[PDB]
Every structure is written in C-alpha cells, then in structure tokens.
C-alpha cells in the first residue's frame, strides 16, 4: 500500500505538529519555517537579484538550458515562507526541468495584504519578459498559497495584455480563500498537516477585508480562458484536494489544457520532502518532464 517513507513521514509530522486550536504568533511560525527549512543540494548555484522591488534568487541546478526560466512562487499561506524556505525544492525543480528558476521573495501579509503578492508576481513575470526571455521559453510554478498565486498571476497578466508562458504547474494549490470545500472535512483525518482554523487565519490576514471570491485571490472563481497548459499536482491525503479537482474542472470548462494528478497517500506539497520521500523526488521529476514537454511543443 503506502511506502514506508510516507508512513514514517506522516508519523514524524504528527509528532511535531502543534495541537489544534493553539494560536502560534506569526513571527514564531515564520522563524520556525525558516529554522526547519532544508538546505539546498551542494550543486545548486544561486545568485541574488532584485526583481520588481523584491529580493530574489536565480536558482540554477546543473544542466540548465540557456534562454529558459521558471518564475517560482513559494508557499506559506501568503503570510510566511521565503527564498530560504523553498530553495531546496526549487533547486530540484530546476534540476528536473533543466531550467533556472527565479525564486521571488514577494510581499507578505499582514504587512502587505492582497493584492500585493499578485502585483509582485505579475511584475516579476513582466521583468522576465523585459530581460529578454521569450514567453514560449517560460514557465510559472508554485506551491500551496504559491500554487494559487500562479493562477492569479496568469489571470492578471492576461487581463493586462501580457503573453502567456508555455506552461504553469501549481503544486497543492490553495485557489479558494473561502476554505469551504468538502475535503477540509473528508480529508482532514488523513492530513497530518496543520491545521486549520489556522488556514482561515491566513486567509483573513491576506484578504484584510477583501472579497474571498475575488478572482485574483481565489482563481478557482476566475475566468481562466486563454491560460497555458496546466499540470496540477495534489495529494489524495490533503485538505486542499477539492481545490485542485475544482481548478481542473474550471480550466477544462474554460478551454484550458489541464492535467490533474492526484497522488495516492501523498500529503500537502509532498515534493518538499524529496530528501526522504521517493514520491517527492518522483513528483518533482514529473514537474520537470512536463515543463520540458511543453517547451518542446
Ligand atoms: Cl500580499
Ligand atoms: Na488526458
């Protein structure tokens, strides 16, 4: 059934998880995420750059093809996460796709609420086009809050007249700020991650009074017509299951070439656990293949 890695991983995550209900201050969560972040592989080279007023890093694994790039939007519920927390996983995505990744330190809430993150994402994409990268040589990817942001950035870029990239790969996307999908109940017991009444708090902090059904905050409610080919990754054992299934339905309905992959026994952004999780490495390899596939077309 389930690999021994995932089983032990779920065990470890449940042991370290903070009890439901307990309110962890934001700076504490932010420092905790930074503290436990995985160190990127020794062969991942990095270059600090500033993009659209944001700190960023070009994350290049060996084997990167010149002319191609990935705009990567990190997870962290729009309130935490950074270049440092995602450098390891992004390095591996760069390895599998044979393309350098632009890891953006976009503005976070509550200091900079919605639509600050979307503006930064769109500006970073504009920046890439301005640097000379061709739309057909580009890809946008991100996890969790970052996965939703991938879609939000695409819709906003499109509305502003920007060309669409060759592909987009949202990982465990959070594309519905309302958090009302059934999976928050049907997949809760199997989701070792936290938890959430904790997730409603992040939505509150990000929106800061904005309509939770705003297209740029919750892409599952947006018009996705014209968006590029999509690869949607999501674990069957996560509370955001329904977000990915509904995103896929919305996309196909809007004429978008969408490919949803629900990985059995997997958890929220299981990719991040590639060091100890075979499925993690596998999923990342798949993201890379899909990106290469779309760039070849
Ligand atoms: Cl923001
Ligand atoms: Na198909």
Number of strands: 8
Sheet with most strands: strand arrangement = 1-2-4-3-5-6-7-8
**Bound chemical compounds:** chloride ion, sodium ion
CATH homologous superfamily designation? Alpha/Beta hydrolase fold, catalytic domain
- Under CATH, the topology can be stated as Rossmann fold
Largest sheet report: 8 strands, mixed
Give the CATH architecture: 3-Layer(aba) Sandwich
Cα end-to-end separation: 36 Å
Can you tell me the overall shape?
globular
Radius of gyration: 17 Å
Short note summarizing the structure:
The protein is an alpha/beta fold and 297 residues long. 39% of the residues lie in helices and 16% in strands. This is Esterase/lipase.
Please characterize this protein's 3D structure.
This is Esterase/lipase. It comes from uncultured bacterium. The chain is an alpha/beta fold. The protein has one domain: 3-Layer(aba) Sandwich (Rossmann fold). It is built from nine helices and eight strands. An eight-stranded mixed beta sheet has the order 1-2-4-3-5-6-7-8, with helices on both faces. β5, α5 and β6 form a beta-alpha-beta unit. α4 packs across α5. The radius of gyration is 17 Å and the shape is globular. The N and C termini lie far apart (36 Å). Chloride ion (CL) binds next to α4.
